[PDB]
Amino acid sequence: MKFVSFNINGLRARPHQLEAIVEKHQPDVIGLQETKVHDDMFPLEEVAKLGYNVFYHGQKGHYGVALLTKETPIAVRRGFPGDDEEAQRRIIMAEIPSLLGNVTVINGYFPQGESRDHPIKFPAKAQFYQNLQNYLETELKRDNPVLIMGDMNISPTDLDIGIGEENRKRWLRTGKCSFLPEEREWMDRLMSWGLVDTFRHANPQTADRFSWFDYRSKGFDDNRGLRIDLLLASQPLAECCVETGIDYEIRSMEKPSDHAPVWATFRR
């Protein structure tokens, strides 16, 4: 079962990248973030033509998530139970069937946060992680197959930072979000529940693979980016991970999203 996560940054502006992912990877499940399209305008026929079932929610020009699956899910919903409207445009959760059990899949577009001192965006980010943590602890078990994917907007370790030492320190000094100590705390708490960062686990010493590169600075050319798009899997799933990757080739396409698609393949 292959999973691909991709912050497309405008689904209707980049049908070419979505088709490329399907052709190249033939994935069983695709989680999209920042689709930026209103539900009434979602490319339902186009997605159906690609051979996928799809569940989605977003609003015009902002947020938006979609979960494309080859097989039909047992259950799917937007947001965690009790979540507000905004959270519903940032999270899709599903139970995907397999012969001997179900896999819980969570696709999220986590708040960027902007800066530690932003009176609205930073609390929103903290609360988003708190809601996820609480869902995990109250409804799931570390022994269940769970896969959390998406744009986390947090670089878990320093091996995930490629913008340069001086820039790294300036960001910390000014409180710019991505790798603040508070943010790392939320991420560590999440991992401690019993999740494995698939790419990092398969590539324990790689310090030159990133998933996001800033447009304006032309970061992709110099490989100056951050690895903030992750695929976190619980124990029983992590044990079966045979391949992981970040697709630089797709990020090399014309009119590309600033994010590279990331993937993980599970096979026993």
PDB file of C-alpha atoms in Angstrom:
ATOM      1  CA  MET A   1       0.000   0.000   0.000  1.00  0.00           C
ATOM      2  CA  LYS A   2       1.672   3.213  -1.180  1.00  0.00           C
ATOM      3  CA  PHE A   3       0.836   6.624   0.256  1.00  0.00           C
ATOM      4  CA  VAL A   4       1.723   9.991  -1.234  1.00  0.00           C
ATOM      5  CA  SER A   5       1.256  13.318   0.548  1.00  0.00           C
ATOM      6  CA  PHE A   6       1.414  16.545  -1.460  1.00  0.00           C
ATOM      7  CA  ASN A   7       0.768  20.172  -0.599  1.00  0.00           C
ATOM      8  CA  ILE A   8      -0.306  21.130  -4.118  1.00  0.00           C
ATOM      9  CA  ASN A   9      -0.777  24.808  -3.273  1.00  0.00           C
ATOM     10  CA  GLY A  10      -3.694  25.285  -5.670  1.00  0.00           C
ATOM     11  CA  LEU A  11      -5.231  22.117  -7.085  1.00  0.00           C
ATOM     12  CA  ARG A  12      -6.861  23.765 -10.110  1.00  0.00           C
ATOM     13  CA  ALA A  13      -3.629  25.549 -11.006  1.00  0.00           C
ATOM     14  CA  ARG A  14      -1.644  22.295 -11.070  1.00  0.00           C
ATOM     15  CA  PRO A  15      -3.546  19.335 -12.583  1.00  0.00           C
ATOM     16  CA  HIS A  16      -0.299  18.464 -14.357  1.00  0.00           C
ATOM     17  CA  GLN A  17       1.525  17.643 -11.122  1.00  0.00           C
ATOM     18  CA  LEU A  18      -1.331  15.487  -9.811  1.00  0.00           C
ATOM     19  CA  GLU A  19      -1.341  13.459 -13.056  1.00  0.00           C
ATOM     20  CA  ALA A  20       2.449  13.111 -12.825  1.00  0.00           C
ATOM     21  CA  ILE A  21       2.147  11.670  -9.302  1.00  0.00           C
ATOM     22  CA  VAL A  22      -0.462   9.147 -10.488  1.00  0.00           C
ATOM     23  CA  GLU A  23       1.529   8.118 -13.579  1.00  0.00           C
ATOM     24  CA  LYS A  24       4.854   7.851 -11.795  1.00  0.00           C
ATOM     25  CA  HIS A  25       3.754   6.403  -8.443  1.00  0.00           C
ATOM     26  CA  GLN A  26       0.413   4.675  -9.034  1.00  0.00           C
ATOM     27  CA  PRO A  27      -0.356   5.292  -5.322  1.00  0.00           C
ATOM     28  CA  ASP A  28      -3.177   3.622  -3.386  1.00  0.00           C
ATOM     29  CA  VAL A  29      -3.824   6.742  -1.307  1.00  0.00           C
ATOM     30  CA  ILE A  30      -3.032  10.403  -2.036  1.00  0.00           C
ATOM     31  CA  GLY A  31      -3.453  13.133   0.581  1.00  0.00           C
ATOM     32  CA  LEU A  32      -3.562  16.696  -0.764  1.00  0.00           C
ATOM     33  CA  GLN A  33      -3.191  19.907   1.230  1.00  0.00           C
ATOM     34  CA  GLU A  34      -3.788  23.542   0.329  1.00  0.00           C
ATOM     35  CA  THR A  35      -6.093  22.674  -2.552  1.00  0.00           C
ATOM     36  CA  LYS A  36      -7.532  26.239  -2.306  1.00  0.00           C
ATOM     37  CA  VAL A  37     -10.756  25.339  -4.089  1.00  0.00           C
ATOM     38  CA  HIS A  38     -14.368  25.691  -3.023  1.00  0.00           C
ATOM     39  CA  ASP A  39     -16.262  22.381  -2.778  1.00  0.00           C
ATOM     40  CA  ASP A  40     -18.689  23.340  -5.575  1.00  0.00           C
ATOM     41  CA  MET A  41     -15.653  23.872  -7.836  1.00  0.00           C
ATOM     42  CA  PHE A  42     -13.718  20.698  -6.946  1.00  0.00           C
ATOM     43  CA  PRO A  43     -12.592  18.654 -10.054  1.00  0.00           C
ATOM     44  CA  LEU A  44     -14.751  15.616  -9.220  1.00  0.00           C
ATOM     45  CA  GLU A  45     -15.014  14.271 -12.781  1.00  0.00           C
ATOM     46  CA  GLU A  46     -11.294  14.750 -13.374  1.00  0.00           C
ATOM     47  CA  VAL A  47     -10.379  12.882 -10.208  1.00  0.00           C
ATOM     48  CA  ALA A  48     -12.883  10.117 -11.010  1.00  0.00           C
ATOM     49  CA  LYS A  49     -11.308   9.808 -14.462  1.00  0.00           C
ATOM     50  CA  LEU A  50      -7.926   9.256 -12.768  1.00  0.00           C
ATOM     51  CA  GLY A  51      -9.471   6.209 -11.078  1.00  0.00           C
ATOM     52  CA  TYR A  52      -9.900   7.529  -7.538  1.00  0.00           C
ATOM     53  CA  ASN A  53     -12.631   7.879  -4.943  1.00  0.00           C
ATOM     54  CA  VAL A  54     -12.305  11.263  -3.277  1.00  0.00           C
ATOM     55  CA  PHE A  55     -13.320  12.986  -0.057  1.00  0.00           C
ATOM     56  CA  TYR A  56     -12.596  16.677   0.318  1.00  0.00           C
ATOM     57  CA  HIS A  57     -13.373  20.028   1.891  1.00  0.00           C
ATOM     58  CA  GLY A  58     -12.031  23.560   1.467  1.00  0.00           C
ATOM     59  CA  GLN A  59     -13.001  27.137   0.640  1.00  0.00           C
ATOM     60  CA  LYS A  60     -12.166  29.541  -2.210  1.00  0.00           C
ATOM     61  CA  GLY A  61      -8.496  30.508  -2.223  1.00  0.00           C
ATOM     62  CA  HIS A  62      -7.619  29.172   1.244  1.00  0.00           C
ATOM     63  CA  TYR A  63      -6.843  25.901   3.063  1.00  0.00           C
ATOM     64  CA  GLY A  64      -8.413  22.753   1.688  1.00  0.00           C
ATOM     65  CA  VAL A  65      -7.660  19.047   1.915  1.00  0.00           C
ATOM     66  CA  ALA A  66      -8.646  15.996  -0.133  1.00  0.00           C
ATOM     67  CA  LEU A  67      -8.055  12.286   0.291  1.00  0.00           C
ATOM     68  CA  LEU A  68      -7.950  10.207  -2.901  1.00  0.00           C
ATOM     69  CA  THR A  69      -8.236   6.448  -2.477  1.00  0.00           C
ATOM     70  CA  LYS A  70      -8.324   3.571  -4.980  1.00  0.00           C
ATOM     71  CA  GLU A  71     -10.367   1.401  -2.574  1.00  0.00           C
ATOM     72  CA  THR A  72     -13.536   2.570  -0.805  1.00  0.00           C
ATOM     73  CA  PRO A  73     -13.035   3.536   2.854  1.00  0.00           C
ATOM     74  CA  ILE A  74     -15.087   2.098   5.696  1.00  0.00           C
ATOM     75  CA  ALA A  75     -15.516   5.597   7.145  1.00  0.00           C
ATOM     76  CA  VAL A  76     -14.290   9.082   6.375  1.00  0.00           C
ATOM     77  CA  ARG A  77     -14.860  12.499   7.939  1.00  0.00           C
ATOM     78  CA  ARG A  78     -13.571  16.050   7.915  1.00  0.00           C
ATOM     79  CA  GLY A  79     -11.992  17.312  11.121  1.00  0.00           C
ATOM     80  CA  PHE A  80     -11.840  15.318  14.366  1.00  0.00           C
ATOM     81  CA  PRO A  81     -15.205  14.953  16.146  1.00  0.00           C
ATOM     82  CA  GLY A  82     -16.175  18.285  17.672  1.00  0.00           C
ATOM     83  CA  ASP A  83     -13.850  20.374  15.447  1.00  0.00           C
ATOM     84  CA  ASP A  84     -14.890  23.791  14.157  1.00  0.00           C
ATOM     85  CA  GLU A  85     -15.372  24.818  10.524  1.00  0.00           C
ATOM     86  CA  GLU A  86     -11.770  25.898   9.967  1.00  0.00           C
ATOM     87  CA  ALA A  87     -10.340  22.620  11.293  1.00  0.00           C
ATOM     88  CA  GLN A  88     -12.725  20.790   8.949  1.00  0.00           C
ATOM     89  CA  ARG A  89     -10.956  22.462   6.006  1.00  0.00           C
ATOM     90  CA  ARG A  90      -7.602  21.179   7.308  1.00  0.00           C
ATOM     91  CA  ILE A  91      -8.151  17.553   8.329  1.00  0.00           C
ATOM     92  CA  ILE A  92      -9.599  14.434   6.737  1.00  0.00           C
ATOM     93  CA  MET A  93      -9.578  11.140   8.624  1.00  0.00           C
ATOM     94  CA  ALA A  94     -10.400   7.712   7.176  1.00  0.00           C
ATOM     95  CA  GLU A  95     -10.487   4.011   7.978  1.00  0.00           C
ATOM     96  CA  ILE A  96      -9.031   2.093   5.018  1.00  0.00           C
ATOM     97  CA  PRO A  97      -9.624  -1.666   4.884  1.00  0.00           C
ATOM     98  CA  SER A  98      -6.953  -4.327   4.431  1.00  0.00           C
ATOM     99  CA  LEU A  99      -7.476  -8.103   4.499  1.00  0.00           C
ATOM    100  CA  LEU A 100      -6.698  -8.573   8.198  1.00  0.00           C
ATOM    101  CA  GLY A 101      -7.470  -5.168   9.713  1.00  0.00           C
ATOM    102  CA  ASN A 102      -8.148  -1.474   9.176  1.00  0.00           C
ATOM    103  CA  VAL A 103      -5.626   1.324   8.801  1.00  0.00           C
ATOM    104  CA  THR A 104      -6.547   4.717  10.245  1.00  0.00           C
ATOM    105  CA  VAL A 105      -5.299   7.467   7.955  1.00  0.00           C
ATOM    106  CA  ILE A 106      -5.177  11.124   8.964  1.00  0.00           C
ATOM    107  CA  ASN A 107      -4.356  13.763   6.338  1.00  0.00           C
ATOM    108  CA  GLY A 108      -3.669  17.190   7.764  1.00  0.00           C
ATOM    109  CA  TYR A 109      -2.735  20.690   6.660  1.00  0.00           C
ATOM    110  CA  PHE A 110      -1.267  22.027   9.900  1.00  0.00           C
ATOM    111  CA  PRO A 111      -1.294  25.819  10.604  1.00  0.00           C
ATOM    112  CA  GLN A 112       2.003  27.449   9.624  1.00  0.00           C
ATOM    113  CA  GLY A 113       1.897  29.677  12.741  1.00  0.00           C
ATOM    114  CA  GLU A 114       3.902  32.563  11.246  1.00  0.00           C
ATOM    115  CA  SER A 115       5.668  33.661  14.432  1.00  0.00           C
ATOM    116  CA  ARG A 116       5.667  32.966  18.156  1.00  0.00           C
ATOM    117  CA  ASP A 117       4.191  36.407  18.845  1.00  0.00           C
ATOM    118  CA  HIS A 118       1.278  36.350  16.381  1.00  0.00           C
ATOM    119  CA  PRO A 119      -1.759  36.629  18.683  1.00  0.00           C
ATOM    120  CA  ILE A 120      -3.922  34.359  16.536  1.00  0.00           C
ATOM    121  CA  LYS A 121      -1.874  32.046  14.289  1.00  0.00           C
ATOM    122  CA  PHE A 122       0.508  30.627  16.876  1.00  0.00           C
ATOM    123  CA  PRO A 123      -2.185  29.641  19.413  1.00  0.00           C
ATOM    124  CA  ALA A 124      -4.103  28.162  16.472  1.00  0.00           C
ATOM    125  CA  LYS A 125      -1.094  25.977  15.663  1.00  0.00           C
ATOM    126  CA  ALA A 126      -0.617  24.907  19.310  1.00  0.00           C
ATOM    127  CA  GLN A 127      -4.306  24.026  19.611  1.00  0.00           C
ATOM    128  CA  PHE A 128      -4.247  22.059  16.365  1.00  0.00           C
ATOM    129  CA  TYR A 129      -1.480  19.821  17.704  1.00  0.00           C
ATOM    130  CA  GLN A 130      -3.240  19.542  21.073  1.00  0.00           C
ATOM    131  CA  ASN A 131      -6.443  18.347  19.325  1.00  0.00           C
ATOM    132  CA  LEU A 132      -4.489  15.725  17.386  1.00  0.00           C
ATOM    133  CA  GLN A 133      -2.693  14.524  20.533  1.00  0.00           C
ATOM    134  CA  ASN A 134      -5.980  14.265  22.420  1.00  0.00           C
ATOM    135  CA  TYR A 135      -7.628  12.309  19.600  1.00  0.00           C
ATOM    136  CA  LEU A 136      -4.733   9.846  19.520  1.00  0.00           C
ATOM    137  CA  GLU A 137      -4.712   9.333  23.280  1.00  0.00           C
ATOM    138  CA  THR A 138      -8.456   8.996  23.741  1.00  0.00           C
ATOM    139  CA  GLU A 139      -9.510   7.046  20.602  1.00  0.00           C
ATOM    140  CA  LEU A 140      -6.538   5.095  19.292  1.00  0.00           C
ATOM    141  CA  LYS A 141      -3.966   2.583  20.533  1.00  0.00           C
ATOM    142  CA  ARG A 142      -0.270   2.583  19.617  1.00  0.00           C
ATOM    143  CA  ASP A 143      -0.754  -1.039  18.551  1.00  0.00           C
ATOM    144  CA  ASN A 144      -3.289  -0.098  15.863  1.00  0.00           C
ATOM    145  CA  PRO A 145      -2.042   0.676  12.320  1.00  0.00           C
ATOM    146  CA  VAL A 146      -2.091   4.464  12.105  1.00  0.00           C
ATOM    147  CA  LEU A 147      -0.672   6.736   9.423  1.00  0.00           C
ATOM    148  CA  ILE A 148      -0.523  10.509   9.898  1.00  0.00           C
ATOM    149  CA  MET A 149       0.544  12.436   6.808  1.00  0.00           C
ATOM    150  CA  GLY A 150       0.573  16.008   5.682  1.00  0.00           C
ATOM    151  CA  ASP A 151       2.234  19.376   5.838  1.00  0.00           C
ATOM    152  CA  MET A 152       3.187  19.553   9.533  1.00  0.00           C
ATOM    153  CA  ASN A 153       4.901  22.910   9.172  1.00  0.00           C
ATOM    154  CA  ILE A 154       7.534  21.748  11.668  1.00  0.00           C
ATOM    155  CA  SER A 155      11.068  20.460  10.956  1.00  0.00           C
ATOM    156  CA  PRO A 156      11.490  17.709  13.602  1.00  0.00           C
ATOM    157  CA  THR A 157      15.293  17.832  13.875  1.00  0.00           C
ATOM    158  CA  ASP A 158      18.140  19.991  12.609  1.00  0.00           C
ATOM    159  CA  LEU A 159      18.852  17.432   9.881  1.00  0.00           C
ATOM    160  CA  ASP A 160      15.575  18.740   8.366  1.00  0.00           C
ATOM    161  CA  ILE A 161      16.834  22.342   8.046  1.00  0.00           C
ATOM    162  CA  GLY A 162      18.743  23.309   4.920  1.00  0.00           C
ATOM    163  CA  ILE A 163      18.310  27.081   4.817  1.00  0.00           C
ATOM    164  CA  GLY A 164      21.753  27.678   6.326  1.00  0.00           C
ATOM    165  CA  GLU A 165      23.122  28.288   9.834  1.00  0.00           C
ATOM    166  CA  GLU A 166      22.842  32.065   9.808  1.00  0.00           C
ATOM    167  CA  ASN A 167      19.254  31.915   8.591  1.00  0.00           C
ATOM    168  CA  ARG A 168      18.376  29.198  11.093  1.00  0.00           C
ATOM    169  CA  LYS A 169      19.618  31.377  13.952  1.00  0.00           C
ATOM    170  CA  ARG A 170      17.914  34.529  12.655  1.00  0.00           C
ATOM    171  CA  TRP A 171      14.572  32.672  12.473  1.00  0.00           C
ATOM    172  CA  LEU A 172      14.977  31.483  16.067  1.00  0.00           C
ATOM    173  CA  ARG A 173      16.030  34.957  17.247  1.00  0.00           C
ATOM    174  CA  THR A 174      12.992  36.561  15.622  1.00  0.00           C
ATOM    175  CA  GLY A 175      10.601  33.766  16.632  1.00  0.00           C
ATOM    176  CA  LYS A 176       9.706  32.784  13.057  1.00  0.00           C
ATOM    177  CA  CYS A 177       7.852  29.430  12.984  1.00  0.00           C
ATOM    178  CA  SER A 178       9.089  26.032  11.743  1.00  0.00           C
ATOM    179  CA  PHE A 179      11.629  24.828  14.294  1.00  0.00           C
ATOM    180  CA  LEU A 180      11.078  26.767  17.532  1.00  0.00           C
ATOM    181  CA  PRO A 181      11.678  24.878  20.817  1.00  0.00           C
ATOM    182  CA  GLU A 182       7.929  24.968  21.612  1.00  0.00           C
ATOM    183  CA  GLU A 183       7.131  23.521  18.194  1.00  0.00           C
ATOM    184  CA  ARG A 184       9.685  20.743  18.673  1.00  0.00           C
ATOM    185  CA  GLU A 185       8.014  19.978  22.025  1.00  0.00           C
ATOM    186  CA  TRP A 186       4.660  19.383  20.299  1.00  0.00           C
ATOM    187  CA  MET A 187       6.341  17.199  17.711  1.00  0.00           C
ATOM    188  CA  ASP A 188       8.223  15.179  20.348  1.00  0.00           C
ATOM    189  CA  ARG A 189       5.014  14.621  22.286  1.00  0.00           C
ATOM    190  CA  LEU A 190       3.344  13.379  19.084  1.00  0.00           C
ATOM    191  CA  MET A 191       6.200  10.957  18.285  1.00  0.00           C
ATOM    192  CA  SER A 192       6.255   9.715  21.881  1.00  0.00           C
ATOM    193  CA  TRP A 193       2.679   8.460  21.492  1.00  0.00           C
ATOM    194  CA  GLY A 194       4.264   5.794  19.293  1.00  0.00           C
ATOM    195  CA  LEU A 195       4.894   7.187  15.809  1.00  0.00           C
ATOM    196  CA  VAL A 196       7.893   6.745  13.508  1.00  0.00           C
ATOM    197  CA  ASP A 197       8.985   9.404  10.998  1.00  0.00           C
ATOM    198  CA  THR A 198       9.233   7.030   8.021  1.00  0.00           C
ATOM    199  CA  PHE A 199      11.712   8.996   5.910  1.00  0.00           C
ATOM    200  CA  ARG A 200      13.974   9.786   8.864  1.00  0.00           C
ATOM    201  CA  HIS A 201      13.925   6.186  10.099  1.00  0.00           C
ATOM    202  CA  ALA A 202      14.927   4.859   6.672  1.00  0.00           C
ATOM    203  CA  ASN A 203      17.487   7.621   6.185  1.00  0.00           C
ATOM    204  CA  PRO A 204      18.913   8.235   9.658  1.00  0.00           C
ATOM    205  CA  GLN A 205      21.854  10.436   8.600  1.00  0.00           C
ATOM    206  CA  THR A 206      20.551  12.250   5.501  1.00  0.00           C
ATOM    207  CA  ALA A 207      20.798  16.023   5.920  1.00  0.00           C
ATOM    208  CA  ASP A 208      20.190  17.105   2.324  1.00  0.00           C
ATOM    209  CA  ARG A 209      16.589  16.121   1.491  1.00  0.00           C
ATOM    210  CA  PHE A 210      13.832  18.662   1.983  1.00  0.00           C
ATOM    211  CA  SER A 211      10.165  18.943   1.038  1.00  0.00           C
ATOM    212  CA  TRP A 212       9.598  22.693   0.928  1.00  0.00           C
ATOM    213  CA  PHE A 213      11.576  25.373  -0.965  1.00  0.00           C
ATOM    214  CA  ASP A 214      10.658  29.062  -0.987  1.00  0.00           C
ATOM    215  CA  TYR A 215       9.599  30.527  -4.346  1.00  0.00           C
ATOM    216  CA  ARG A 216      11.037  34.059  -4.083  1.00  0.00           C
ATOM    217  CA  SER A 217      14.492  33.020  -2.930  1.00  0.00           C
ATOM    218  CA  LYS A 218      14.689  30.249  -5.578  1.00  0.00           C
ATOM    219  CA  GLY A 219      15.483  27.801  -2.788  1.00  0.00           C
ATOM    220  CA  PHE A 220      14.952  24.707  -4.906  1.00  0.00           C
ATOM    221  CA  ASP A 221      17.962  25.528  -7.112  1.00  0.00           C
ATOM    222  CA  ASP A 222      20.402  25.445  -4.183  1.00  0.00           C
ATOM    223  CA  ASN A 223      18.528  22.737  -2.294  1.00  0.00           C
ATOM    224  CA  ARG A 224      17.845  25.269   0.469  1.00  0.00           C
ATOM    225  CA  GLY A 225      14.622  24.153   2.095  1.00  0.00           C
ATOM    226  CA  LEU A 226      12.961  22.493   5.074  1.00  0.00           C
ATOM    227  CA  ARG A 227      11.556  18.990   5.470  1.00  0.00           C
ATOM    228  CA  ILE A 228       8.104  19.719   6.898  1.00  0.00           C
ATOM    229  CA  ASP A 229       5.943  17.261   4.919  1.00  0.00           C
ATOM    230  CA  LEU A 230       5.941  13.981   6.816  1.00  0.00           C
ATOM    231  CA  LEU A 231       4.499  10.475   6.908  1.00  0.00           C
ATOM    232  CA  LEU A 232       4.305   9.257  10.518  1.00  0.00           C
ATOM    233  CA  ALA A 233       3.409   5.605  11.059  1.00  0.00           C
ATOM    234  CA  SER A 234       2.680   3.550  14.153  1.00  0.00           C
ATOM    235  CA  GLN A 235       4.768   0.451  15.001  1.00  0.00           C
ATOM    236  CA  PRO A 236       2.988  -2.315  13.033  1.00  0.00           C
ATOM    237  CA  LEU A 237       2.969  -0.162   9.905  1.00  0.00           C
ATOM    238  CA  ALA A 238       6.506   1.209  10.337  1.00  0.00           C
ATOM    239  CA  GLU A 239       7.887  -2.350  10.491  1.00  0.00           C
ATOM    240  CA  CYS A 240       6.563  -2.873   6.924  1.00  0.00           C
ATOM    241  CA  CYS A 241       7.932   0.318   5.385  1.00  0.00           C
ATOM    242  CA  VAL A 242      10.059  -0.790   2.411  1.00  0.00           C
ATOM    243  CA  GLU A 243      10.506   2.532   0.602  1.00  0.00           C
ATOM    244  CA  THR A 244      10.357   6.249   1.374  1.00  0.00           C
ATOM    245  CA  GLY A 245      11.175   9.318  -0.673  1.00  0.00           C
ATOM    246  CA  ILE A 246      10.744  12.964  -1.567  1.00  0.00           C
ATOM    247  CA  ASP A 247      10.127  13.582  -5.258  1.00  0.00           C
ATOM    248  CA  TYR A 248      12.551  16.219  -6.532  1.00  0.00           C
ATOM    249  CA  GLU A 249      11.666  15.311 -10.112  1.00  0.00           C
ATOM    250  CA  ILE A 250       8.052  16.432  -9.667  1.00  0.00           C
ATOM    251  CA  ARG A 251       9.248  19.587  -7.888  1.00  0.00           C
ATOM    252  CA  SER A 252      11.324  20.205 -11.071  1.00  0.00           C
ATOM    253  CA  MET A 253       8.216  20.549 -13.267  1.00  0.00           C
ATOM    254  CA  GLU A 254       6.908  23.740 -14.831  1.00  0.00           C
ATOM    255  CA  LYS A 255       4.561  25.885 -12.675  1.00  0.00           C
ATOM    256  CA  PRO A 256       5.251  23.687  -9.632  1.00  0.00           C
ATOM    257  CA  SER A 257       3.976  23.858  -6.064  1.00  0.00           C
ATOM    258  CA  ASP A 258       6.649  25.057  -3.615  1.00  0.00           C
ATOM    259  CA  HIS A 259       6.374  21.628  -1.947  1.00  0.00           C
ATOM    260  CA  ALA A 260       7.746  18.339  -3.274  1.00  0.00           C
ATOM    261  CA  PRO A 261       5.494  15.276  -2.890  1.00  0.00           C
ATOM    262  CA  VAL A 262       6.595  12.776  -0.224  1.00  0.00           C
ATOM    263  CA  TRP A 263       5.763   9.062  -0.138  1.00  0.00           C
ATOM    264  CA  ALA A 264       6.053   5.811   1.836  1.00  0.00           C
ATOM    265  CA  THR A 265       5.428   2.259   0.641  1.00  0.00           C
ATOM    266  CA  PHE A 266       4.269  -0.473   3.011  1.00  0.00           C
ATOM    267  CA  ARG A 267       4.514  -4.101   1.956  1.00  0.00           C
ATOM    268  CA  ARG A 268       4.950  -7.370   3.859  1.00  0.00           C
TER     269      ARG A 268
END
